[PDB]
Every structure is written in C-alpha cells, then in structure tokens.
Ligand binder design. Sequence first.
Ligand code: V2M
Ligand code: V2M
Lengths: 303, 299
Amino acid sequence: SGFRKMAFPSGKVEGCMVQVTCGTTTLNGLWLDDVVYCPRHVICTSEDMLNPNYEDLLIRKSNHNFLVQAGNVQLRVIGHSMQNCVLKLKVDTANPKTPKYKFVRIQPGQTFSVLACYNGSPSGVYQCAMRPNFTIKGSFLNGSCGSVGFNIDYDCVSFCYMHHMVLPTGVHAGTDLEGNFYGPFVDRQTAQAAGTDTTITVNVLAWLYAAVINGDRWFLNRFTTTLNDFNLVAMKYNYEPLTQDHVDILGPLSAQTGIAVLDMCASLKELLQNGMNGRTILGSALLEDEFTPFDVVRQCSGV
Amino acid sequence: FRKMAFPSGKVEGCMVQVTCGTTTLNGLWLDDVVYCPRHVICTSEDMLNPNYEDLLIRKSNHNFLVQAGNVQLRVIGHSMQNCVLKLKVDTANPKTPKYKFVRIQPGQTFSVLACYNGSPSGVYQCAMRPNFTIKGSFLNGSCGSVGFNIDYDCVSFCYMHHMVLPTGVHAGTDLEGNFYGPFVDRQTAQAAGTDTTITVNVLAWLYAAVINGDRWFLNRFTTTLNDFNLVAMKYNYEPLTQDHVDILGPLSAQTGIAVLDMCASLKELLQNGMNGRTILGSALLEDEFTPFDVVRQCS
Ligand SMILES: *[C@@](O)(CO)[C@H](C[C@@H]1CCNC1=O)NC(=O)[C@H](CC(C)C)NC(=O)c1cc2c(OC)cccc2[nH]1
Ligand SMILES: *[C@@](O)(CO)[C@H](C[C@@H]1CCNC1=O)NC(=O)[C@H](CC(C)C)NC(=O)c1cc2c(OC)cccc2[nH]1
C-alpha cells in the first residue's frame, strides 16, 4: 500500500565516506579496500579550475599533499593515480567496513540512490534518475562533490555516480566510478548547457500503473493505440520513444492490473493532449518520470 | 526542492526480526532491549479481537524468537507498554547509537526505514498528517519499521508502524506504544478523520520560494494570528500554534518577512487563488516540508 520515492538504505555506503583535502580544496571521497576515490579537481586551486591541465597539475603533487580524514582518523596516502576525472589515493589502511561492491555505468532512464555528503559526513539520501540528456535532478550544495550514487542488490553495492558539477539550470552532472562523465560535460569551472531534456516515457507509464494499483483510474479511457501512433504523439511532446523492450518490461504491471500496455499508452496520449485539468495523480500535478518499472514492481507487487 | 531522508545507517544497525509462533515482524534493538508491536503475540485469528493482557499472560520469555539476521538473541524478560512489547535480551547492541524517544506533532517530518524480516529495504521521508496518518509505502511484513530524525549524532525515534487504513494510508505509534490518532491495533477497517493542509509547512515553503527569488505573492498586508486561523480553517488549513510561529522564526529573520505578513500573503493565495501563476515551479502549495527541512536543503 502506498507509493513513495524510496532510496536504498545508505549504511553500507556511509561506512565508506571520507574527506579529501588538497591545499584549500576539500570534498568527499569513497574509501573501498585500500583506495580512496574522489573527483580529481581536488588537486586544483581556484585559479586552476578555469582551465586545468590535470596531468600537468597532478605530476606536481606528492602523496603527502593529500590529507584524507576518516572521522577523527587521518589515513596515510602511499600512492596516487588518476583514471579520467577520478583520483585514486592508495592508503596504507584497508577500510574495514568495505561492502561487497561493483562499479557500473548506468543507462539513461535508470534510477539510483544518492548519499549527499559534506566534509566526508553523510547528510541525506534520495532517489534520482539518470535523465536522457545525462543530467540528474539532484539536491547538492557547496562541498557535495564526491558524493556517490548507487544501487544495492542483495548485499552488493553497485556504485554508478560520483558528483562533480551543477549546471546553470540547477541540474547536476557527474561521472561513473571510472571517471567518465555522463553527458557532454567537462570538469572545468565554466557554465555548461545540457542537451534537450526529454521525458522517460517507460517510467511515466510505470508510474501510471502504480497510480492504478493504488486505486486511482480517473485518467484511463476506453481507447487503444498502436505503438507507432503512440510514439508519434510522444515524440511531438519531447517524450522518448517506447520500444518493444519497454513494452515487455511493463508486462508484470500490465498483468497485475489487467491494463494492456498499449491501453495505458492511449491514456498517456490523452493526458498529453488534454493536460490534467487541475487533477493530480499520486498527489502530483505533473507526469512523473523518475520511477522505473522495477521501482513500481518492488513497491506495488501483490498489493 | 525534493524529499530527502536522513542517512539510515545508524538505524539499520538496530533492526531485528521478532517472531512468536508463525507471526513475524520487525523490532528495534537498543542497548539490551528490543521494542516491537505487541501484536506479534497474536495468531491471525487472535488479531480480530485481541485481549492483549490475556494473550500475554500465556507467553513466556522462551516463546519469543528475536534474530539479528539469522543470529538468535535470547530473550530474558518481557513487558507490555501500551501497544509495544519490550523484550530484554542477553546482548547489548554494539551498534546502539545515541538516541531518544520523542512524540511528534502533526506537520513534523521524519524518515522511515521500511524493513521486512528484520532486513532494511528502503528509506523515505514522511510527514505526520493532521489526521494522524502518514502516506507511507508499506507491504505485508513491514510492521515494526520505525521513523526517525537525526540531530547531530542522536537518533530521535518517533514512529513504529502498525496499521494500513482502508484508504491506503498508514497509522502507528510512538516508541512508548501510544498510537498517533484514534487508531487501535486490531484487524479491523478504521477510518481516519478528514485531513487538512499543514499551514506551518506551507508557510515554510513560501519562505523557501522567497529565499530563491520567487516572491510575486508577497503582499502589502498583515493580519493577526487569530484572524488568520479563523480564515485558514474555512479553507481546510490547520490553525497555527505559538510553536509554529516560533519555528518559523529563523526563516522570517533570514528573509526579513514577519511571520504574520507571510500569513497575510497566504490568506490572499487562499482567497484569490494563484491566477495561473506558479511558486517554485508548481501550481500546488507544498505542505510536507517543515521549516527545518527548508533550512536543511538550503544549507
Ligand atoms: C563540488 O563540491 C566542488 O568540489 C561542486 C558541487 C557544486 C557546488 C554547488 N552545487 C554543486 O553541485 N562542483 C563545482 O563547484 C564544479 C567544479 C568543477 C568540476 C571544476 N563547478 C561547477 O559546478 C560550476 C562552475 C560553474 C560556472 O562557472 C563559471 C558557471 C555556472 C555554473 C557552474 N557550475
Ligand atoms: C504489519 O506487518 C503486521 O504485523 C501489518 C502492516 C500492513 C500490511 C500491509 N501493509 C501494511 O502497512 N499490519 C497489519 O496487518 C495490521 C495488524 C493489526 C495491528 C493487528 N492490520 C491492518 O493494518 C489492517 C486490518 C484491516 C482490515 O481488517 C478487517 C480492514 C481494512 C484495513 C485493515 N488494515
């Protein structure tokens, strides 16, 4: 019963957050085994960040230039390398609370939990989606760099995001844990625009099914649509196309509710053309697109 | 603005499962006591119309299975406190945080750590409604999940889950076992009173809008607290208390907008509507962010 934007429990990640400081620059790092991972622009001064030659700036640093604090303990750095936009500090102590983990690069439209941290201290946890334009609508303040995004399956933490940048529009950009940005962004102190921000259609459909499972059907209709005719209307409204894989992925929700996927497409088509007429769905006045089909299935299966 | 939960790790380290017969739910292990909903002692048929004092008389310490994961914690004492059971166990939890038990007011927010079989599953922010329900997300097996706030290093537990209502909202107790609202722990359909909008939180939201430069709704008027409360009630808004006025103090100081001037602005929004305008990008006035949440997300 109910449907809420839900994050994974954050404790396995909290036990890995540390504080990294180089010069007057401080941000968060992720301590796994005997390595601390953090945004490489920590090595930068304020003047460097405008056009940093990172390889040039890094070679001029020594292991002792990096102060890593874990709680009240300082960890001694005994090596350091760079992998794209991520710095890897070898420390002489393995983190005893390292969980089972993997690094993965998430696909646009997928969700993950963010543990927002400041000065190496966890501050809040929330769910995000990787948008089609590879930005995320995060909540991050000064000092949040190095905060990470993750999913958990059984006991294994899959890290997928590390935070680097806020755009002029107030959305956020970052990298995977191999240091590659999501999107066309660069770790330099410049104002950057993203590509056009399309709506994650398969997710909107999942959330409509969640609304039905929770007792709201006001937006359904007796009509159907073909997949192509739906996509024509969806693209007109800057929605992503729905693929046959999306249709299949929605199967379990369609089975649970008895609403054919293309019948829900016809409902969404009507909502796009007519608007919501001051009504709300699951408490929202907008069509929500940051819950995946699996997000809905795991909260609403059996209800 | 977004709902943000507290990091959940300090609470995760306290979740256990408690079973009596085939009835299983979650409990909270702090020091050498495990707290859980007292209906764990019920068979399914017992929960239709339970006499808990009589049911408990028939239970002894050795009838309670407490597990941290798969590891059993031997129960060495038990007692009932309102609608919660307290099981003394022979092991003090080494992960016990600094904590307190608090009873919150409508409008206050908290994080819920939803758990199943003693295993944390998800975390999300909830607000206590004026009708003493929360809009949670809870499946079978979720009872005994807790809600909490974290202040510095101290976990303040405020909620333990017991009930879903026919409308699909949730009800529960504080950690002394006293329900929020008129609800009882019985297998029966129970109705919550009509709900109202949480005025103090809408005001916090309007302050948040002003902080971010969105201030078209500020008007030239003020009001008294009494006159405002009487108007607000005709729009299904809660009356403000003195505590509400006080907790708006910091946002009022930050923006320079007196609390009663902002109340007069809200009154105009209620009486005249939004005129197809938005506030913080929304035609809806948000009532699930407290003044603390607004400060916590702006700094
Ligand atoms: C990190 O904490 C820095 O360590 C920080 C996080 C942002 C602070 C405010 N909210 C955030 O998410 N990131 C930055 O400060 C980055 C630093 C880069 C990677 C060197 N820069 C930006 O976020 C950035 C710079 C500019 C800009 O310039 C000029 C103009 C407009 C936006 C903008 N963002
Ligand atoms: C706990 O897991 C029980 O241990 C369970 C939580 C609900 C299950 C599905 N989602 C939940 O939030 N709580 C219950 O099952 C309670 C048990 C009481 C305390 C003895 N029962 C209800 O919440 C319940 C019973 C009825 C009902 O009956 C008749 C009719 C309508 C609603 C309703 N809710």
